[PDB]
Amino acid sequence: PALKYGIVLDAGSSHTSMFVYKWPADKENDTGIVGQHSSCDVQGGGISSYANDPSKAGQSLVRCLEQALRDVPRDRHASTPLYLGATAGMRLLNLTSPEATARVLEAVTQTLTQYPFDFRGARILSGQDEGVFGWVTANYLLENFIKYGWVGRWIRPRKGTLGAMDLGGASTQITFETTSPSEDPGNEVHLRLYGQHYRVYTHSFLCYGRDQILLRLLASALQIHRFHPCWPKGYSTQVLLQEVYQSPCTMGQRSAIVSLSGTSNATLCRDLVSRLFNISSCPFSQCSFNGVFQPPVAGNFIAFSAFYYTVDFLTTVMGLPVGTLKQLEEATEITCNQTWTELQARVPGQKTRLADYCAVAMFIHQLLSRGYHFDERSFREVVFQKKAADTAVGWALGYMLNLTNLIPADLPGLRKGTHF
Ligand SMILES: O=c1ccn([C@@H]2O[C@H](COP(=O)(O)OP(=O)(O)NP(=O)(O)O)[C@@H](O)[C@H]2O)c(=O)[nH]1
Ligand SMILES: [Ca+2]
């Protein structure tokens, strides 16, 4: 049972993770065959957080790369491909300073080239890449690309695919198979996988990741209220204004330090979040928001990353159902109305992120209902999960599959034309 391995470093805005994948040498073009073998969480921030100290970006990777030498057998190092892909942290740094961006990419490249893996490059993914590759990960792992049935009796229509919603720290993606006509080339994706054509919609909303949304709501609370209606009553902190306004995401919203306190006001919080979504103009037949084309959502979806972490909080810590859009809205209201002592009574251990759940839950409720136009019928088809077949869901597996060429466009010998 001879195995091959492959490695991806996912260099997100808030963290870097390393995934090591393994697969049998001679079944390697089978769908769903590649699985996660191990992973590692790099300590500290994302590589973009070393914008002004680029050499620390390369050093941040060492510990996880030392784990990869132990995870992958030594005789396979030389032939195990290694990739780094970076997402919206580096896309935002690139708007601010393409030179500092280059110096960070150079430092991670220098570090990664000292290791004995087959290093295939450090790249910034486009928004489209990031959305499509997570869609391919989820569907590959759940075996949605198998042609179901047998000769003389193929299931029709073919097996549906799972849409993907990824809430990262600095951008959010929505990607799904659609029968609707394309109206914007930047959203239009055509894939050829195991002999089949998939027509796909994708969009990445830069600045609509969790950390950037929190920063925009804070900038907005500062300007409109001088209290934060999404923060819990009893919670307060010293806000450093230069950190609030240095993001490309908040420059458009412009004393070194101001005290700001929560007020547990679910209604004002909802009003605050609503201003994130411009619904006033659409140059297409229909839009999601901000003038962006989007056909009707359809089919099942998996919502992972911060959709999952936030729903996990509402169900596991607050003990509240989130099965319907109306329950998610009630759960957000109850969470937002909690005072800071009440929220802390529920969380015996570390309290990081605790003051932010109200704002994040509220954004997610609005994003799904107002931004993407899910309703009770389509929302019922959404599941919140972060893992499929023992593999973390994300873009890293899909990316690895594509660059290593492990998903054939067509089946061998076209399977004798038996799927025509
Ligand atoms: O366990 C966790 C880990 C991360 N998070 C937060 O979820 C958000 C999304 O995390 P992520 O690792 O999917 O984002 P990312 O760093 O890959 N950011 P991007 O994908 O480059 O935009 C972040 O704000 C992170 O702080 C949790 O809430 N709980
Ligand atoms: Ca990410």
Keywords:
six-stranded mixed sheet; alpha/beta; 2 domains; monomer; ATP-binding; 35% helix; Nucleotidyltransferase, domain 5; binds calcium ion; 420 residues; five-stranded mixed sheet; binds the ligand O=c1ccn([C@@H]2O[C@H](COP(=O)(O)OP(=O)(O)NP(=O)(O)O)[C@@H](O)[C@H]2O)c(=O)[nH]1; ADP phosphatase activity; 18 strands
Molecular structure report:
The chain has 420 residues and is an alpha/beta fold. It has 2 domains: 1-125 and 390-420, ATPase, nucleotide binding domain (Nucleotidyltransferase, domain 5, 2-Layer Sandwich), CATH 3.30.420.40; 126-389, Nucleotidyltransferase, domain 5 (2-Layer Sandwich). Helix content is 35%, strand content 24%. The chain is built from 14 helices and 18 strands. The protein has helices at residues 54-60, 62-71, 88-96, 98-113, 127-141, 210-224, 241-245, 266-274, 305-317, 325-337, 340-345, 357-371, 376-379, 396-403; strands at 3-11, 16-24, 35-41, 81-86, 118-124, 149-150, 153-154, 163-167, 171-177, 188-193, 196-206, 228-233, 236-240, 257-262, 301-304, 382-384, 387-388, 391-392. The chain has a 6-stranded mixed beta sheet. The protein has a 5-stranded mixed beta sheet with strand order 3-2-1-4-5, sandwiched between helices. A hairpin with a 2-residue loop joins strand 10 and strand 11 (196-206). It is globular. The two termini are 33 Å apart. Residues 12, 87, 168 line the site of calcium ion. Belongs to the GDA1/CD39 NTPase family. Its cofactor is Ca(2+); Mg(2+). Residues 1-420 are extracellular. Its EC number is 3.6.1.-. It is an enzyme of class 3 (hydrolase). The PDB classes it as hydrolase.
